[PDB]
Design a protein around this nucleic acid. Structure first.
Ligand SMILES: [Mg+2]
Ligand SMILES: [Zn+2]
Length: 134
DNA sequence: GTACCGGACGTTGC
DNA sequence: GCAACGTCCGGTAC
């Protein structure tokens, strides 16, 4: 399908085959009207190791939106197992208040473990901010 | 190499 | 109310 982001109607872009590391592409709209994109990769150092979803594509996207003050965003990833239950329950925490970010798993995704979902999830950030690690 | 630990948030089962 | 459970993660004990 095609998802709306401001005035744009964007579909899923080409992503590398899932090798074991989840790679994703994140789209937003700049303070002018143009469409910008950034690639996020699983792993890497995170400022919140106390949140199990901070190392994921959805968590890195949420933290990016919080840092750069982005209100709307749209991310596509390539993980066939879907979006983990952590990213389901803690994204709105990580996300700044009233920020809208939809996470689109690859089409045809099949969850395996508990909490993982294969459908699109539209998160709405809550007034809660992430707890400091120390 | 395998096997756990662990913060943290909401869900499910009891 | 409480126990298990969820990583795309590192880190620690065998
Ligand atoms: Mg929040
Ligand atoms: Zn996740």
């Amino acid at each position: 399908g095609s998802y709306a982001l401001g005035p744009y109607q964007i579909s899923a872009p080409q992503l590398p085959a899932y090798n074991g590391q989840t790679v994703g592409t994140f789209y937003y709209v700049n303070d002018a009207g143009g469409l910008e994109s950034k690639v996020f990769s699983s792993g890497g150092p995170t400022p919140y190791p106390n949140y199990a979803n901070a190392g994921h594509v959805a968590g890195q996207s949420a933290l990016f939106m919080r840092d750069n003050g982005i209100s709307e965003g749209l991310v596509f990833h390539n993980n066939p197992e879907g979006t983990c239950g952590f990213c389901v329950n803690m994204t709105e925490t990580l996300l700044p208040e009233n920020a809208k970010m939809t996470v689109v798993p690859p089409e045809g995704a099949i969850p395996v473990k508990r909490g993982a979902t294969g459908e699109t999830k539209v998160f709405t950030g809550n007034s809660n901010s992430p707890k400091s690690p120390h």
